[PDB]
Amino acid sequence: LKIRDAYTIVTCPGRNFVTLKIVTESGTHGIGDATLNGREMAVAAYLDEHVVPALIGRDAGRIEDTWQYLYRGAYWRRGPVTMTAIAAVDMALWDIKAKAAGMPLYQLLGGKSRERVMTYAHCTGQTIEDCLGEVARHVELGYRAVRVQSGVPGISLPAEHVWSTEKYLNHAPKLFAAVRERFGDDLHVLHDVHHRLTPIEAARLGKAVEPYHLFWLEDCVPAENQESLRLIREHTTTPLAIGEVFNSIHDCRELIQNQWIDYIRMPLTHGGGITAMRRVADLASLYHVRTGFHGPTDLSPVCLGAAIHFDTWVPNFGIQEHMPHTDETDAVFPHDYRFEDGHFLAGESPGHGVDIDEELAAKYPYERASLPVNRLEDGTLWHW
């Protein structure tokens, strides 16, 4: 199990993905997701030039040692590029270890804690009515949970969006009222605030939406300063989720220990892989916090498969976001996880159950694509 080859693959079967492959002398291989949306080539370079050469000859079985070697050894610690590179290695090594053990990953982690993995779907629309149409559509597909978003009346390179907080705050509660009126109380309803509020504005929104009993209100405020959550938590009983933009337990230790959130959203690809996220989930468990992994299209099927395995074992599972990948993406990344009746089921193949078709990946060259930015009506560069 000494490493004989390690290299990245960059491919764009509908959107960009970066993948790390590690191959042992014996021939067993593992893959890990290294995709960082809108900054993809920074991770590719971090891996190609600085990490991959150091992997050659290392014992692939030494997962923990390798994690610490890359984390501490980089000298400059934490960060999105850094932790995604480390996550990619970690995911590939856990893939290899599960294969060597002849077990699907969830078994190697401690076995199954649940029989299936609940997901939510994205329901979006220009008007509230448009959104309700999407909710009905996804309910018919078997989803037990939906994230709802609608437009606010009056509202390659980064697209430039315009934002008004005050108009959003007045309008948003009407969406949830309408969802409850049409679909009733049994449906789980989620909403993503996407970083745009100040804490007292989020406190106001949280209170306003209490009657509609949201599964969570997500990313209320930028949280580099973790104390930003305090005012929200002290003013509302609407459950709170945060963390898709985090990469370290150190981004959320205080959020969790002070009981300022209900769900932690940091995913495998950006959170330093299985090794690190086990520790985050375990810390969360002490405070009744549950996992809600970020699961957008910009995390590859490699992350999704590993996440479904993790979701299957972890005691404090909350929910798994599902944004379906394109057929082309699924073809590039064959996998054995299944979606049925609104839930994922983990694969039984040894490893995390995902592979990459390198020949096919090579047919979809990288295409630069950036995330949007958001400005206030006066032009102020805001949070998107």
Q: Which residues are catalytic?
A: 194
Q: How far is the CB of 127 from a copy of itself (least distance, A)?
A: 27
- CA–CA separation, 357 vs 353, rounded Å? 13
Given a contact cutoff of 8 angstroms between Cβ atoms, the answer to whether 193 and 240 are in contact is: no
Does the annotation flag 330 for ligand binding? no
Is the separation of the CB atoms in 320 and 351 below 8 Å? no
Instruction: Pick one of a copy of itself, Mg ion, none as the site partner of residue 277 (Cβ within 5 to 8 A by kind).
Output: none
Provide the binding-site residues for Mg ion, judged by CB under 5 A: 192
From a copy of itself, Mg ion, none, interface partner of 207 (C-beta below 5 to 8 A by class): none
Q: What is the DSSP letter of 10?
A: E
Q: Which is nearer to a copy of itself, 260 or 344 (CB)?
A: 260
Q: Which of 27, 115, 140, 157 binds a copy of itself (CB under 8 A)?
A: 157
Residues of span 260-289 touching a copy of itself by CB under 8 A: 270
C-alpha 33: how far from its chain's center? 12
CB of residue 177 vs Mg ion: minimum separation in angstroms?
22
Element (H, E) at 345: strand 343-345
Candidates 222, 316, 331, 339: give the one binding a copy of itself (CB under 8 A).
222
**What DSSP letter does each residue of 230-288 carry, written as one string?**
HHHHHH--S-EEE-TT--SGGGTHHHHHTT--SEE---TTTTTHHHHHHHHHHHHHTTT
Per partner kind, with CB cut-offs from 5 to 8 A, the member of Mg ion, a copy of itself, none near residue 192 is Mg ion
Name which of a copy of itself, Mg ion, none residue 41 binds, using a CB cut-off of 5 to 8 Å depending on partner kind: a copy of itself
- Closest residue to bound Mg ion by CB: 192
In the bound state with Mg ion, the residue whose beta carbon lies nearer, of 192 and 298, is: 192
Using DSSP, state whether 320 is helix, strand or coil. strand
Least Å distance, CB 244 to Mg ion, is: 5
Give least dist CB 119 to Mg ion, A.
Answer: 15
Structure tokens at 50: 């600085």
- The continuous run of DSSP H or E covering 9 comes out as strand 3-11
The region, left, alpha or beta by phi > 0 then psi within -120 to 50, assigned to residue 143 is beta
Is 321 annotated in some ligand binding site? yes
- Per the annotation, does 336 bind a ligand? no
| Of the candidate residues 4, 14, 45, 170, the single one contacting a copy of itself (CB under 8 A) | 45
Handedness of CA 282, 287, 290, 296 (dihedral sign): negative
Position among 153, 158, 211, 334 found at the interface with a copy of itself (CB under 8 A): 158
Q: Are 1 and 59 in contact (CB under 8 A)?
A: yes
**Between 67 and 106, whose beta carbon lies closer to a copy of itself?**
67
Per-residue binding letters, 56-95, with a copy of itself (x by CB under 8 A): ---------x--xx--xxxxxxxxxxxx-x----------
Q: Binding a copy of itself by CB under 8 A: which of 2, 50, 137, 288?
A: 50
Partner that binds at residue 55, options a copy of itself, Mg ion, none, CB closer than 5 to 8 Å by kind: none
Maximum separation of any 2 CA atoms in the chain, in Å: 62
With respect to Mg ion, which residue has the nearer C-beta, 212 or 216?
Answer: 216
- In the bound state with Mg ion, the residue whose beta carbon lies nearer, of 134 and 192, is 192
Q: Annotation-wise, does 298 bind a ligand?
A: yes
Helices (DSSP H) in the chain: which residue ranges?
40-45, 52-55, 63-73, 80-101, 105-109, 128-140, 165-183, 199-208, 230-235, 253-257, 273-285, 301-313, 327-332, 358-361
Q: Which residues bind a copy of itself (CB under 8 A)?
A: 36-46, 48-50, 53-54, 65, 68-69, 72-83, 85, 156-158, 222, 224-225, 245, 247-248, 250, 253, 270, 368, 370-371, 373, 381-384
